[PDB]
C-alpha cells in the first residue's frame, strides 16, 4: 500500500502519521513538541523510525517523509527516505489541492482560521513560495491604519482582529469587567473563556460580544477582499476551528466591498480533517 | 529594424508608436480621444496604417500590434497583423520586465502611482491575470474598515487615499476654506498640495502623511501576499511617495519581507513600451 510519513510540528504537540495514497490516515502518533530544536529533531527521528517500522508491519510501502512546520539531512540519512518540508499554511493549501476542495483548481487560496491566521496560495496549480520563501503571510494583511496590536509587532493585522487568540483576549477583557457572561452562562473553574464563549454570549444576546465579533469578521473579510483584488482566485477555502463561524460575514464583506469583477469567487469551509498531516503527506505522494 | 506597433488608450489624448526590439520609440502619434467608440475605433486604424506606412519608410519590420487599456477583428483583418491586448497595469509591469528594472526578475510588482493607482504582478517571469481576469486590481486594496469613499463604491481603498484624484479632491477642500495657499505660491491639484506641504503647511502635510501611509500599507499587503523581490513605483506621484512607502514597510512589514527593494521607474511612455513588448515577446 503506497504511502508516506507526514510530520506536523504545530501547536503544543508533535504529530506523525502513516498516510495512504488515497488520503487515509492509517496510524497517527501525537506527542509533546519540544521547544528546543536539538531535541525536537531527536523526537521526530524516533517517532518516524517507529512509524516506519510499523508501516513495514502494517503492509505499507512508504515512499518518503513530508513535514509541515536542517531537518532533511538527518532524517534522509537515517530513514533512507527523501524528505520534503514546507510551512503549515502551504501544507493546508496542498491538502486541499490533493485531497480537498482544491482538486483540479488552477488558482485558489486557503486561509487558515483558528488560534492564528495564515494560508497558502495556489496559482498555475502550484504554491507561491516567494523570493524570501515567506509568501502568503496572510495573518498580517493590514486592514487598518491604527488597529489592535499584533504578535508580529505591528498593528491592524487581520490576525490581531480575527484569530482565536485575538478573540480570547477580547473574551478575557469582558469577563474581567463582568461584561461577557449573560442570560445564564457559567464557566468552569479549570476552563477559561475563549472564542466559543464570545460567540455563545453573542448568540445569547450579548451586544458587546456581537460588536467585537462583527469587527473581527469585517477585518478578516477585508483581508480576503485584499486577496481577491491581488490574486483574483476562483475559490477561497476557509479552514480551521473558526472557519464555520466566519464564512457568513466574509461572504457579506465580499458582496459589500469587493469589486464586481471578482464576485464570482466562491468561499467554502474545508472538510478536511488533519490537513497539516495530509499536506505534509501530499508532497511525498505527489513527487514519488 | 525588427519593431512593433504600440497603442495606448488612456485619459484625454490617444497615443500610437513604432517601438524597436531594443525599446526605442521611433515615432509617436498623439490625438484626441473621442466621445464614442465608433469615433474612437475609426481613428485607431487610421493612425495605424499611417504609422504602419511610415515604419517601412524607416526600414522597420512591424511584427504586429499591442494595445494598452473585438478590436483584433478589424485591425488584424485590415493591417494583416497579430494584435495583442492587455490593461494599463499589466503593460506597466511588462514594460519594466522587458525594458525596465524588472529585467530577469522572477517575482516583482509594478504599482502605478499617478492620477489613479493600479498595477501588475509578475510571478515566475509572467503576468498574473487571475480566475476572471481581474488580478492585480491593486488600487482597491483596503487599509481601513471605514476609510474614504472610492470610485468603485467601496471605501478604504488605497486609490481612495493616495490617488492623484484623491489628493486633488483634498486640494480643492483646503482651497475652498482658503487654508491651502501658504507663503510662496499663487486649477488646484496634488502638485500644489505637495508644495504647500514642502513650503510649510501642516494640514497639507497631515493629509499627505495619511495618504503615503495608506499606500505603504497597501504595499505591505502586497509583500505579505506575494513576497516580491522588488516593487516598482511608477507615475507622476512615484518620486513623491517612495520615501514614506519605504518607511511604512520598515516600520510594519515582517522581518521576512524587509529584503524587498522599492524603486521608482525609469521608463518614459511605459504604457506604449509594455504594449509593444507583447508583440516583441511573441516575435
Ligand atoms: Zn501581524
Ligand atoms: Zn476602490
Coordinates of C-alpha atoms and ligand atoms in Angstrom, one line a residue:
Chain A
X1 CA 0.0 0.0 0.0
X2 CA 1.8 3.1 -1.3
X3 CA 2.1 5.7 1.4
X4 CA 4.3 8.4 3.1
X5 CA 5.1 9.6 6.6
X6 CA 3.7 13.0 7.5
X7 CA 5.1 15.1 10.3
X8 CA 3.3 18.1 11.9
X9 CA 5.4 20.4 14.0
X10 CA 2.5 22.5 15.3
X11 CA 0.9 23.9 18.4
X12 CA 2.0 22.2 21.7
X13 CA 2.0 18.7 20.1
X14 CA 4.1 16.9 17.5
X15 CA 2.2 14.5 15.3
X16 CA 3.5 11.9 12.9
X17 CA 1.2 9.7 10.8
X18 CA 1.2 7.0 8.2
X19 CA -0.9 8.4 5.3
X20 CA -2.1 6.3 2.3
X21 CA -2.1 7.4 -1.3
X22 CA -5.9 7.8 -1.2
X23 CA -5.6 10.1 1.9
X24 CA -6.4 7.6 4.6
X25 CA -4.6 8.4 7.9
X26 CA -3.6 4.8 8.7
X27 CA -2.0 5.3 12.1
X28 CA -1.3 8.6 14.0
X29 CA 1.1 9.3 16.9
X30 CA 0.9 12.6 18.9
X31 CA 3.5 13.7 21.5
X32 CA 4.8 16.7 23.3
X33 CA 6.6 19.1 20.9
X34 CA 10.0 20.0 22.4
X35 CA 10.6 23.8 22.4
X36 CA 14.4 23.4 21.8
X37 CA 15.4 22.2 18.2
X38 CA 18.2 19.8 19.1
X39 CA 15.6 17.8 21.0
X40 CA 12.8 18.3 18.5
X41 CA 14.8 16.6 15.8
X42 CA 15.6 13.7 18.1
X43 CA 11.9 13.1 18.9
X44 CA 11.0 13.3 15.2
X45 CA 13.6 10.6 14.3
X46 CA 12.4 8.3 17.0
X47 CA 8.7 8.7 16.1
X48 CA 9.5 8.3 12.4
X49 CA 11.6 5.2 12.9
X50 CA 8.8 3.7 15.0
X51 CA 6.1 4.8 12.4
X52 CA 8.3 3.5 9.6
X53 CA 9.0 0.1 11.4
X54 CA 5.2 -0.2 11.9
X55 CA 4.5 0.6 8.2
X56 CA 6.6 -2.5 7.4
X57 CA 4.4 -4.4 9.8
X58 CA 1.1 -2.8 8.5
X59 CA 1.7 -3.7 4.8
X60 CA 2.6 -0.2 3.7
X61 CA 5.2 0.9 1.1
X62 CA 6.4 4.2 2.4
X63 CA 7.7 6.5 -0.3
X64 CA 9.1 9.3 1.8
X65 CA 8.6 11.9 4.6
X66 CA 6.8 15.2 4.5
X67 CA 7.0 17.9 7.2
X68 CA 4.6 20.7 8.0
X69 CA 6.0 23.4 10.3
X70 CA 18.4 21.2 8.8
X71 CA 15.6 18.6 9.1
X72 CA 16.3 17.0 5.7
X73 CA 19.9 15.9 6.3
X74 CA 19.5 13.7 9.5
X75 CA 16.1 12.1 8.5
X76 CA 17.1 11.1 4.9
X77 CA 20.4 9.7 6.2
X78 CA 18.7 7.6 9.0
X79 CA 15.4 6.5 7.4
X80 CA 16.8 6.2 3.8
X81 CA 14.0 8.2 2.5
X82 CA 13.5 11.6 0.8
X83 CA 12.3 14.4 3.0
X84 CA 10.1 17.4 1.9
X85 CA 9.5 20.4 4.1
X86 CA 7.1 23.4 3.9
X87 CA 5.1 25.5 6.3
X88 CA 1.7 24.8 7.7
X89 CA -0.1 27.4 5.6
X90 CA 1.3 25.9 2.4
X91 CA 0.6 22.4 3.6
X92 CA -3.0 23.4 4.3
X93 CA -3.2 24.6 0.6
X94 CA -1.7 21.3 -0.6
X95 CA -4.1 19.2 1.5
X96 CA -7.0 20.9 -0.4
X97 CA -5.3 20.7 -3.7
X98 CA -4.7 17.0 -3.5
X99 CA -7.5 15.6 -1.2
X100 CA -9.8 18.6 -0.6
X101 CA -11.9 21.2 -2.5
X102 CA -8.9 22.4 -4.3
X103 CA -8.7 19.3 -6.6
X104 CA -8.4 20.5 -10.1
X105 CA -8.3 24.2 -9.5
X106 CA -5.7 26.3 -11.2
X107 CA -5.8 29.4 -8.9
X108 CA -7.1 29.3 -5.3
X109 CA -6.4 30.4 -1.7
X110 CA -6.6 28.5 1.6
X111 CA -7.0 30.8 4.6
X112 CA -6.5 29.1 8.0
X113 CA -8.9 30.5 10.6
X114 CA -8.0 29.2 14.1
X115 CA -5.7 30.0 17.0
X116 CA -3.8 32.1 14.4
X117 CA -4.4 33.0 10.8
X118 CA -2.3 32.0 7.9
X119 CA -2.7 30.5 4.5
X120 CA -1.5 29.2 1.2
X121 CA -1.8 30.4 -2.4
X122 CA -2.0 28.0 -5.4
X123 CA -1.5 29.6 -8.7
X124 CA -1.0 27.8 -12.1
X125 CA -1.5 24.6 -9.9
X126 CA 1.5 25.4 -7.7
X127 CA 2.3 27.1 -4.4
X128 CA 3.6 30.6 -4.5
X129 CA 6.7 30.4 -2.2
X130 CA 8.1 33.9 -2.6
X131 CA 11.5 35.4 -3.2
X132 CA 12.3 35.2 0.6
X133 CA 10.3 31.9 0.9
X134 CA 7.8 33.7 3.1
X135 CA 4.9 34.3 0.6
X136 CA 1.3 34.0 1.7
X137 CA 1.7 35.5 5.2
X138 CA -2.0 36.1 5.2
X139 CA -2.3 36.7 9.0
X140 CA -0.5 40.0 8.6
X141 CA -2.6 41.6 5.9
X142 CA -3.2 45.1 7.3
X143 CA -6.7 46.4 7.0
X144 CA -6.3 49.4 9.4
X145 CA -4.1 52.5 9.8
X146 CA -4.4 52.1 13.6
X147 CA -5.6 48.7 14.6
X148 CA -5.1 46.3 17.6
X149 CA -1.6 45.2 18.3
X150 CA -0.3 42.1 16.6
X151 CA 2.2 39.4 17.8
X152 CA 4.3 40.2 14.7
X153 CA 5.0 43.6 16.4
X154 CA 2.8 45.7 14.0
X155 CA -0.9 46.7 14.3
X156 CA -4.0 46.4 12.2
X157 CA -3.2 42.8 11.0
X158 CA -6.1 40.6 10.4
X159 CA -4.5 38.1 12.9
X160 CA -4.7 40.9 15.5
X161 CA -8.5 41.1 14.9
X162 CA -9.9 37.7 14.0
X163 CA -7.5 35.0 15.4
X164 CA -8.6 32.6 18.1
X165 CA -6.0 34.3 20.3
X166 CA -7.3 37.7 19.4
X167 CA -10.9 36.7 20.4
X168 CA -9.7 35.1 23.6
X169 CA -8.0 38.4 24.5
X170 CA -11.4 40.1 24.0
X171 CA -13.3 37.3 25.8
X172 CA -11.0 37.7 28.8
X173 CA -11.3 41.6 28.8
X174 CA -15.1 41.4 29.0
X175 CA -15.1 38.5 31.7
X176 CA -12.6 40.6 33.8
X177 CA -15.1 43.5 33.6
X178 CA -18.1 41.2 34.1
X179 CA -19.5 42.0 30.6
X180 CA -19.1 38.6 28.9
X181 CA -21.4 36.1 30.5
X182 CA -25.2 36.7 30.0
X183 CA -28.6 35.0 30.5
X184 CA -27.2 32.0 32.5
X185 CA -23.7 31.3 31.1
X186 CA -21.3 29.6 33.5
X187 CA -17.5 28.9 33.0
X188 CA -15.8 26.0 34.8
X189 CA -13.1 26.6 37.5
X190 CA -10.4 24.9 35.3
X191 CA -11.6 26.1 31.9
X192 CA -11.0 29.8 30.8
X193 CA -13.1 31.9 28.4
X194 CA -12.3 31.8 24.7
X195 CA -13.8 32.4 21.3
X196 CA -16.7 29.9 21.7
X197 CA -17.7 31.8 24.9
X198 CA -17.6 35.1 23.0
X199 CA -19.8 33.6 20.2
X200 CA -22.2 31.9 22.7
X201 CA -22.6 35.3 24.5
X202 CA -23.3 37.0 21.2
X203 CA -25.7 34.2 20.2
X204 CA -27.4 34.5 23.7
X205 CA -27.8 38.3 23.3
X206 CA -24.5 40.0 24.3
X207 CA -24.4 43.3 22.3
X208 CA -20.8 44.0 23.3
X209 CA -19.9 40.5 22.2
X210 CA -21.7 40.8 18.9
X211 CA -20.0 44.1 18.2
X212 CA -16.5 42.6 18.8
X213 CA -17.3 39.7 16.6
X214 CA -18.7 42.0 13.9
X215 CA -15.4 43.8 13.7
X216 CA -13.3 40.7 13.7
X217 CA -15.3 39.2 10.8
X218 CA -15.2 42.5 8.9
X219 CA -11.4 42.8 9.3
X220 CA -10.9 39.2 8.1
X221 CA -13.4 39.8 5.3
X222 CA -11.4 42.9 4.2
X223 CA -8.4 40.6 4.5
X224 CA -10.0 38.2 2.0
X225 CA -11.1 41.1 -0.2
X226 CA -7.4 42.2 -0.4
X227 CA -6.5 38.7 -1.6
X228 CA -9.3 38.8 -4.2
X229 CA -8.0 42.1 -5.6
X230 CA -4.5 40.8 -5.6
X231 CA -4.9 37.2 -6.9
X232 CA -8.4 37.0 -8.3
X233 CA -8.7 33.4 -7.2
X234 CA -11.6 31.2 -8.3
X235 CA -12.1 29.8 -4.7
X236 CA -11.3 30.6 -1.1
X237 CA -11.2 27.8 1.4
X238 CA -11.6 28.8 5.0
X239 CA -10.1 26.2 7.2
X240 CA -9.8 25.6 10.9
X241 CA -12.0 25.8 14.1
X242 CA -13.2 29.3 13.3
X243 CA -13.9 28.7 9.5
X244 CA -17.6 27.7 10.2
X245 CA -18.1 30.9 12.2
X246 CA -16.5 33.4 9.8
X247 CA -17.9 32.2 6.5
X248 CA -21.2 34.1 6.5
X249 CA -19.7 37.5 7.3
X250 CA -16.7 37.1 4.9
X251 CA -19.2 36.5 2.1
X252 CA -21.1 39.6 3.2
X253 CA -17.9 41.6 3.2
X254 CA -17.2 40.2 -0.3
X255 CA -20.7 41.2 -1.5
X256 CA -20.5 44.5 0.2
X257 CA -17.0 45.8 -0.7
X258 CA -15.3 43.6 -3.3
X259 CA -15.2 44.6 -7.0
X260 CA -17.9 43.4 -9.3
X261 CA -15.1 41.9 -11.3
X262 CA -14.3 39.3 -8.6
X263 CA -17.7 38.4 -7.1
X264 CA -17.9 35.0 -9.0
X265 CA -15.4 33.7 -6.5
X266 CA -16.7 31.0 -4.2
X267 CA -15.9 30.8 -0.5
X268 CA -16.2 27.5 1.3
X269 CA -15.3 25.8 4.6
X270 CA -12.8 22.9 4.5
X271 CA -14.0 19.3 5.0
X272 CA -10.5 18.0 5.7
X273 CA -9.5 16.5 9.0
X274 CA -5.8 16.8 9.9
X275 CA -4.9 19.0 6.8
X276 CA -1.3 19.6 8.0
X277 CA -0.6 15.9 8.0
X278 CA -2.4 15.4 4.7
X279 CA -0.5 18.3 3.2
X280 CA 2.9 17.1 4.5
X281 CA 1.9 13.7 3.1
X282 CA 0.9 15.2 -0.3
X283 CA 4.4 16.4 -1.0
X284 CA 5.9 12.9 -0.8
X285 CA 2.8 11.4 -2.6
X286 CA 2.9 13.9 -5.4
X287 CA 6.7 13.8 -6.2
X288 CA 7.1 10.0 -6.0
Chain B
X1 CA 14.7 47.4 -37.7
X2 CA 12.7 44.5 -36.2
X3 CA 9.9 46.5 -34.4
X4 CA 6.3 46.6 -33.2
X5 CA 3.2 48.9 -33.3
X6 CA 2.3 50.1 -29.7
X7 CA -1.1 51.6 -29.0
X8 CA -2.3 53.4 -25.8
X9 CA -5.8 54.1 -24.6
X10 CA -5.9 56.4 -21.6
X11 CA -7.4 59.6 -20.2
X12 CA -7.6 62.5 -22.6
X13 CA -5.3 62.0 -25.7
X14 CA -4.9 58.7 -27.6
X15 CA -1.3 57.6 -28.4
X16 CA 0.3 55.2 -31.1
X17 CA 4.0 54.4 -31.7
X18 CA 6.6 52.4 -33.6
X19 CA 8.9 50.7 -31.0
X20 CA 12.2 48.9 -31.8
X21 CA 13.0 45.4 -30.4
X22 CA 15.7 47.4 -28.5
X23 CA 12.9 49.5 -26.9
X24 CA 13.4 52.8 -28.9
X25 CA 10.2 54.7 -29.5
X26 CA 10.8 55.6 -33.2
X27 CA 7.8 57.8 -33.9
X28 CA 4.9 58.8 -31.6
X29 CA 1.4 59.9 -32.8
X30 CA -0.9 61.7 -30.3
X31 CA -4.5 62.8 -30.9
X32 CA -8.0 63.4 -29.5
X33 CA -9.8 60.6 -27.5
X34 CA -13.4 60.7 -29.0
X35 CA -16.7 60.6 -27.1
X36 CA -17.8 57.4 -28.8
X37 CA -16.1 54.0 -29.7
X38 CA -17.4 54.4 -33.2
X39 CA -15.4 57.6 -33.4
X40 CA -12.5 56.1 -31.4
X41 CA -12.2 52.9 -33.5
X42 CA -12.1 54.9 -36.7
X43 CA -9.1 56.9 -35.5
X44 CA -7.0 54.0 -34.4
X45 CA -7.0 52.0 -37.7
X46 CA -6.2 55.3 -39.4
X47 CA -3.3 56.1 -37.0
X48 CA -2.1 52.5 -37.5
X49 CA -2.0 52.4 -41.3
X50 CA -0.4 55.9 -41.0
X51 CA 2.2 54.5 -38.7
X52 CA 2.5 51.2 -40.5
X53 CA 3.0 53.2 -43.6
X54 CA 5.9 55.1 -42.1
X55 CA 7.6 52.1 -40.5
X56 CA 8.5 50.7 -43.9
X57 CA 9.9 54.1 -45.0
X58 CA 12.2 54.0 -41.9
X59 CA 13.2 50.3 -42.8
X60 CA 11.2 48.7 -39.9
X61 CA 9.5 45.3 -39.9
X62 CA 6.4 45.6 -37.7
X63 CA 5.9 42.2 -36.2
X64 CA 2.4 43.1 -35.0
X65 CA 0.4 45.4 -32.8
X66 CA 0.0 45.8 -29.0
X67 CA -2.7 47.7 -27.1
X68 CA -3.0 49.1 -23.5
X69 CA -6.4 49.9 -22.0
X70 CA -13.1 42.6 -30.6
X71 CA -10.6 45.1 -31.8
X72 CA -8.3 42.4 -33.1
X73 CA -11.1 41.6 -35.6
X74 CA -11.0 45.0 -37.5
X75 CA -7.2 45.6 -37.1
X76 CA -5.8 42.1 -37.8
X77 CA -8.1 42.0 -40.9
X78 CA -7.1 45.5 -42.0
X79 CA -3.3 45.6 -41.1
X80 CA -2.8 41.9 -41.7
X81 CA -1.1 41.6 -38.3
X82 CA -1.3 39.8 -34.9
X83 CA -2.8 42.1 -32.3
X84 CA -2.3 41.7 -28.6
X85 CA -4.4 43.5 -25.8
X86 CA -3.9 43.9 -22.1
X87 CA -4.6 46.6 -19.5
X88 CA -2.5 49.5 -18.4
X89 CA -1.4 48.0 -15.1
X90 CA -0.1 44.8 -16.7
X91 CA 1.5 46.8 -19.5
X92 CA 3.3 48.9 -16.9
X93 CA 4.7 45.6 -15.5
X94 CA 5.6 44.1 -18.9
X95 CA 7.4 47.4 -19.7
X96 CA 9.6 47.0 -16.6
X97 CA 10.2 43.3 -17.3
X98 CA 11.4 43.7 -20.9
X99 CA 12.9 47.2 -20.7
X100 CA 12.8 48.4 -17.1
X101 CA 14.1 47.4 -13.7
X102 CA 12.3 44.0 -13.7
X103 CA 14.7 42.6 -16.3
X104 CA 15.4 39.0 -15.3
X105 CA 13.3 39.1 -12.1
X106 CA 11.1 36.1 -11.4
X107 CA 8.8 37.8 -8.8
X108 CA 8.2 41.6 -8.8
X109 CA 5.3 44.1 -8.7
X110 CA 4.8 47.3 -10.6
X111 CA 2.4 49.8 -8.8
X112 CA 1.2 52.7 -10.8
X113 CA 1.1 55.8 -8.6
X114 CA -0.4 58.7 -10.6
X115 CA -4.0 60.0 -11.2
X116 CA -5.0 56.6 -10.2
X117 CA -3.4 53.6 -8.5
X118 CA -3.1 50.2 -10.1
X119 CA -0.5 47.8 -11.3
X120 CA 0.7 44.4 -12.3
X121 CA 2.2 41.3 -10.6
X122 CA 4.9 39.3 -12.3
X123 CA 5.4 35.8 -10.8
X124 CA 7.7 33.3 -12.4
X125 CA 8.6 35.9 -15.1
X126 CA 4.8 36.0 -16.1
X127 CA 1.7 38.1 -15.5
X128 CA -0.9 37.0 -13.1
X129 CA -4.3 37.5 -14.9
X130 CA -6.5 35.6 -12.5
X131 CA -9.6 33.5 -12.4
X132 CA -12.0 36.1 -14.1
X133 CA -9.0 38.1 -15.5
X134 CA -9.1 40.8 -12.7
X135 CA -5.8 40.0 -10.9
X136 CA -3.6 42.9 -9.7
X137 CA -6.5 45.3 -9.0
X138 CA -4.0 47.0 -6.7
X139 CA -5.7 50.3 -6.4
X140 CA -8.5 48.6 -4.5
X141 CA -6.5 47.1 -1.7
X142 CA -8.4 48.1 1.5
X143 CA -6.4 49.5 4.5
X144 CA -9.3 50.7 6.6
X145 CA -12.6 49.4 8.0
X146 CA -14.1 52.9 7.5
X147 CA -12.0 54.9 5.0
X148 CA -12.6 57.5 2.3
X149 CA -15.2 56.6 -0.3
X150 CA -13.8 55.1 -3.5
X151 CA -14.9 55.3 -7.2
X152 CA -15.6 51.5 -7.1
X153 CA -18.3 52.2 -4.5
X154 CA -16.5 50.8 -1.5
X155 CA -14.3 52.7 1.0
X156 CA -10.7 52.5 2.4
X157 CA -9.1 51.8 -1.0
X158 CA -5.5 52.9 -1.3
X159 CA -6.7 54.7 -4.5
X160 CA -9.3 56.5 -2.3
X161 CA -6.4 57.8 -0.3
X162 CA -3.3 58.2 -2.4
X163 CA -4.5 58.7 -6.0
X164 CA -3.9 62.0 -7.7
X165 CA -7.6 62.4 -7.8
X166 CA -7.8 61.6 -4.1
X167 CA -5.1 64.2 -3.5
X168 CA -6.8 66.7 -5.9
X169 CA -10.1 66.3 -4.0
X170 CA -8.2 67.2 -0.8
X171 CA -6.6 70.1 -2.6
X172 CA -10.0 71.6 -3.6
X173 CA -11.3 71.1 0.0
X174 CA -8.5 73.1 1.7
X175 CA -8.5 75.8 -1.0
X176 CA -12.3 76.2 -0.7
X177 CA -11.8 77.1 3.0
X178 CA -8.8 79.2 1.9
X179 CA -6.4 77.2 4.1
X180 CA -4.3 75.6 1.3
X181 CA -2.3 78.5 -0.1
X182 CA 0.8 79.4 2.0
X183 CA 3.6 82.0 1.8
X184 CA 5.3 81.2 -1.5
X185 CA 2.7 80.4 -4.3
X186 CA -0.2 81.6 -6.5
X187 CA -6.9 74.6 -11.2
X188 CA -5.9 73.2 -7.7
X189 CA -4.2 69.8 -7.6
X190 CA -1.9 67.3 -6.0
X191 CA 1.4 69.0 -7.0
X192 CA 0.2 72.2 -5.2
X193 CA -0.7 70.2 -2.0
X194 CA 2.9 68.9 -2.1
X195 CA 4.4 72.4 -2.5
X196 CA 2.1 73.8 0.3
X197 CA 3.4 70.9 2.4
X198 CA 7.1 71.5 1.3
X199 CA 6.7 75.3 1.9
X200 CA 5.2 74.8 5.4
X201 CA 1.5 73.8 5.5
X202 CA 0.6 71.4 8.4
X203 CA -2.8 70.4 7.1
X204 CA -1.3 69.6 3.7
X205 CA 1.5 67.6 5.4
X206 CA -1.1 65.8 7.6
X207 CA -3.2 64.8 4.6
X208 CA -0.1 63.5 2.9
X209 CA 1.2 61.5 5.8
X210 CA -2.1 59.6 5.8
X211 CA -2.1 59.2 2.0
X212 CA 1.5 57.8 2.0
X213 CA 0.8 55.6 4.9
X214 CA -2.4 54.1 3.3
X215 CA -0.3 53.4 0.2
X216 CA 2.6 51.9 2.2
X217 CA 0.1 49.7 4.0
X218 CA -1.2 48.6 0.6
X219 CA 2.4 47.8 -0.4
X220 CA 2.8 45.9 2.8
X221 CA -0.4 43.9 1.9
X222 CA 1.3 43.0 -1.4
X223 CA 4.5 42.0 0.3
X224 CA 2.6 39.7 2.7
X225 CA 0.7 38.1 -0.2
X226 CA 3.4 37.8 -2.9
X227 CA 6.8 38.3 -1.2
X228 CA 8.2 40.1 -4.3
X229 CA 11.9 40.8 -4.7
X230 CA 11.3 44.3 -6.0
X231 CA 8.5 46.9 -6.0
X232 CA 8.5 49.4 -8.8
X233 CA 6.5 52.6 -8.2
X234 CA 5.6 54.2 -11.4
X235 CA 3.9 57.5 -12.3
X236 CA 3.7 61.3 -11.6
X237 CA 3.5 60.6 -7.9
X238 CA 6.1 57.8 -7.5
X239 CA 9.0 60.2 -6.8
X240 CA 6.9 61.7 -4.1
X241 CA 5.6 58.5 -2.3
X242 CA 8.8 56.4 -2.3
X243 CA 10.2 57.7 1.0
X244 CA 7.1 57.1 3.1
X245 CA 6.4 53.8 1.4
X246 CA 9.9 52.7 2.4
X247 CA 9.1 53.8 5.9
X248 CA 5.7 52.0 6.4
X249 CA 7.5 48.8 5.2
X250 CA 10.4 49.5 7.5
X251 CA 8.0 50.2 10.4
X252 CA 5.4 47.5 9.7
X253 CA 6.2 44.7 7.3
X254 CA 7.5 41.4 8.6
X255 CA 11.3 41.0 9.1
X256 CA 10.9 38.2 6.5
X257 CA 10.0 40.6 3.7
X258 CA 12.3 43.6 4.6
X259 CA 14.8 42.5 1.9
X260 CA 12.4 43.8 -0.6
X261 CA 13.7 46.7 -2.7
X262 CA 11.4 49.6 -3.5
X263 CA 12.3 51.7 -6.5
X264 CA 10.9 54.4 -8.8
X265 CA 10.5 53.7 -12.5
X266 CA 12.9 55.0 -15.2
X267 CA 10.7 54.3 -18.2
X268 CA 9.1 57.0 -20.4
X269 CA 5.8 56.0 -22.0
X270 CA 5.8 52.7 -20.2
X271 CA 2.2 52.1 -21.4
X272 CA 3.4 52.1 -25.0
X273 CA 6.6 50.1 -24.2
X274 CA 4.6 47.4 -22.4
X275 CA 2.1 47.1 -25.3
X276 CA 5.0 46.8 -27.8
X277 CA 6.6 44.3 -25.6
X278 CA 3.7 41.8 -26.1
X279 CA 4.3 41.9 -29.9
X280 CA 8.1 41.6 -29.4
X281 CA 7.7 38.8 -26.7
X282 CA 5.8 36.6 -29.2
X283 CA 8.3 37.6 -32.0
Ligands
LIG1 ZN1 0.8 41.0 12.2
LIG2 ZN1 -11.9 51.1 -4.7

